[PDB]
């Protein structure tokens, strides 16, 4: 299987810039280059990447989207002086050109060209491409928004004729529309396009009216095409997070891309002179982790704007190390997205639930200068995951995993301690291994910086749950999230407010208070679908907003585990990734998929379909009970008395 990261730069790229005096190009400088590889070398994120080389973009691949007129037209730039480079600008709408940039147009394009080629060959499990000029508003036929050619369009048509895909999702997360990626796919059912976008009520350029929710793709591509429009300035992450947990990732999930290509534009982020948003560097990261688990990782991300030169470096490693595998920084002060992102929210979810299914039941009644501070280190565990399976099993273990049974002394006198207060009568050696492995595990876990998360193996349930809870929450570690796969009731008190418990049961269950969420699907042929729904739509906007210290996993023997590798990726951008799964009783198949989930490993595509009726209806239900408590869940406006 494929691994490591791409990172693919060139300091020609850097090597055009405006020639005049044009206040709405002035931004658009080769520093930007220059400050985002420096800010990667900086930080160690380049040296770790895999340096792959630029290459032009041929003729030929530069007709897959652009026509020979326009391609001719630009081909005589290099040969102008800056009064016909003016008069040539002229002709477009917010663009420069300069002597080099033909020549680092193609450079942009053929290092996204490599980029594909690299991920789809498996020589790496994704990268990154750091490119000028940008592409997203590049049109067949016309330069815009200082791009000339565009090169994510290039690489997902690039994708299709090579490698014969028929599934690519592209995620625009730059804070502008990209309108030449929307017009490239309009008609195309294999390419989804999803943007969110400073509009102002088509008030802020390019000031499109199909830059609005109601594009929805045409013909056979209707429903291909996502438009989020952001109607006010200063979004959150909130705002971003429930864009995320509310429009895209169900989209996305249930497309089931073969490819991800990201139009990674940071001009979305806090401090950006064009954006105007709030949302932090940080924020970049768990847009990235979130996406990875689909095409089992096979994701491209090509820089397209970002202009404040601070925030642009801290996003570009924020996201390389996501890429990476680097454990997630805890998003604090997450809540509701503010009333003009939800309507806005509501609004696409409702003009696209004729064509997709999680928002299906809303058709009918029945159904329903700026400052901000620097980002802590993001170091990678020295073992990432440590396994404890029942004595005597050897497993073959990724890389970046180790068993781990030495019990200390220390920790054997607190194993006593502990059974000597609260389990007077319990002789059985093998829980009290059990219980030497929770503590050592865990004392690994939060002490060091060098293991991350764990698996242990267990016998008894209540016993296990307790010490490893209690002395979590002893450590201590502010808040626990528990998610908790069986029946029946566990030693968990959630009366305090430190610990929040996702349940997934066979039994309906009634749900009293605000810090547990039971989610009781129907057994059939379509509890995949629906787990997925309940993950992206319930349980992880409760875990963000909680913002756990620890996440503690527990499935019971007696339990549809083809979804668990999905959360474990998924739950890991809480806590810092910082999870201990118990499992009861051993299976080889669930403790190999949990180890490989645990240890960043991509996981299998879940390919196919829709979830039943009756959880649809459970799931709202929950969110009715919970989103007052939790606004990360809403995903329409509320009702003001
Ligand atoms: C800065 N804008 C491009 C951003 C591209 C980007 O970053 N994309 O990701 C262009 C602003 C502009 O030209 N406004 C305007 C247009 C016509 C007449 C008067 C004013
Ligand atoms: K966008
Ligand atoms: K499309
Ligand atoms: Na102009
Ligand atoms: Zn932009």
């Known amino acids: 299987a494929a691994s490591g990261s791409a990172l693919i730069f060139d300091e020609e790229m850097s090597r055009y810039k405006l020639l005049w005096t044009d206040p709405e190009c002035e931004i658009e400088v080769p520093e ?82 490599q980029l594909v080629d690299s991920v789809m060959k498996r020589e790496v499990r994704n990268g990154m491409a750091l490119v000028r000029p940008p592409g997203h508003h590049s049109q067949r036929s016309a330069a815009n928004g200082f791009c000339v050619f565009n090169n994510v369009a290039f690489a997902a048509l690039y994708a299709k004729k090579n490698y014969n895909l028929n599934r690519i999702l592209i995620v625009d997360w730059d804070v502008h529309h990209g309108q030449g990626i929307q017009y490239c796919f309009e008609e195309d059912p294999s390419v989804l396009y999803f943007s969110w976008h400073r509009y102002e009520h088509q008030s802020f350029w390019p000031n499109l009216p199909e830059s609005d929710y109601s594009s929805v793709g045409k013909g056979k591509g209707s429903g291909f095409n996502i438009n989020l429009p952001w109607n006010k300035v200063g979004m959150t992450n909130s705002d971003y997070l429930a864009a995320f947990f509310h429009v895209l990732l169900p989209v996305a999930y249930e497309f089931d891309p073969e490819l991800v290509i990201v139009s990674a534009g940071f001009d979305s982020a806090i401090g950006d002179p064009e954006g105007e948003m709030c949302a932090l560097p940080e924020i970049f990261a768990h847009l990235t982790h979130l996406l990875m688990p689909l095409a089992a990782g096979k994701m491209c991300v090509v820089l397209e704007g970002g202009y404040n030169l601070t925030s642009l470096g801290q996003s570009v490693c924020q996201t390389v190390h996501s890429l ?80 781990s049974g030495d019990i200390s002394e220390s920790t054997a ?140 996993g527990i499935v019971e023997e007696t339990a549809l585990m083809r979804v668990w ?59 009715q009970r919970l989103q007052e408590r939790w606004g990360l869940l809403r995903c329409t406006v509320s009702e003001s008395w």
């Open 324 to 403: 990476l595998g680097d454990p997630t920084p805890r998003i604090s002060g997450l809540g509701t997205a503010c009333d003009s992102a939800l309507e806005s929210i509501q609004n696409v979810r409702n003009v696209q639930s004729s064509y997709w299914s999680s928002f299906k039941h809303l058709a009918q009644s029945e159904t329903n200068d700026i400052v901000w501070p620097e980002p802590l280190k993001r170091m990678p565990a020295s073992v990432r995951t440590v396994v404890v399976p029942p004595p005597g099993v050897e497993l073959t273990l990724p890389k970046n995993c180790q068993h």
């Open 413 to 552: 006198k607190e194993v006593q301690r502990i059974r000597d207060k609260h389990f007077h009568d319990l002789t059985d050696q093998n829980i009290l291994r059990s219980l030497g492995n929770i503590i050592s595990v865990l004392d690994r876990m939060m002490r060091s910086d060098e293991v991350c998360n764990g698996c242990v193996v267990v016998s008894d349930l209540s016993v296990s749950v307790q010490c490893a809870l209690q002395h979590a929450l002893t450590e201590p570690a502010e808040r626990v999230l528990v998610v908790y796969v069986g029946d029946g009731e566990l030693p968990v008190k959630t009366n305090d407010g430190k610990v929040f418990l996702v349940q997934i049961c066979t039994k309906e269950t009634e749900d009293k208070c605000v810090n547990r969420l039971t989610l009781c699907l129907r057994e059939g042929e379509s509890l995949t679908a629906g787990f997925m729904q309940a993950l992206l739509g319930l349980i992880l906007p409760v875990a963000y907003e909680f913002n756990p210290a620890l996440v503690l």
């Open 32 to 113: 930007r280059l220059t400050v985002s590889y420096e800010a990667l070398r900086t930080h160690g994120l380049a040296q770790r990447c895999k340096a792959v080389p630029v290459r032009q973009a041929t003729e030929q691949e530069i007709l897959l989207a652009h026509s020979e007129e326009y391609l001719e037209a630009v081909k005589q730039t290099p040969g102008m002086n800056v009064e016909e480079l003016m008069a040539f600008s002229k002709k477009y709408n917010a663009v420069y050109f300069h002597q080099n940039i033909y020549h680092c147009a193609k450079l942009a394009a053929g290092a996204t060209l």
């Open 565 to 623: 590798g999905h959360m474990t990726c998924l739950i890991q951008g809480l806590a810092r990734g910082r999870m201990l799964t118990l499992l009861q009783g051993y299976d080889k198949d669930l403790l190999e998929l949990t180890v490989s989930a645990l240890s960043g490993a991509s996981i299998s595509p879940l390919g196919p379909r829709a979830p039943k009726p009756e959880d649809v209806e459970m799931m709202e239900k929950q969110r």
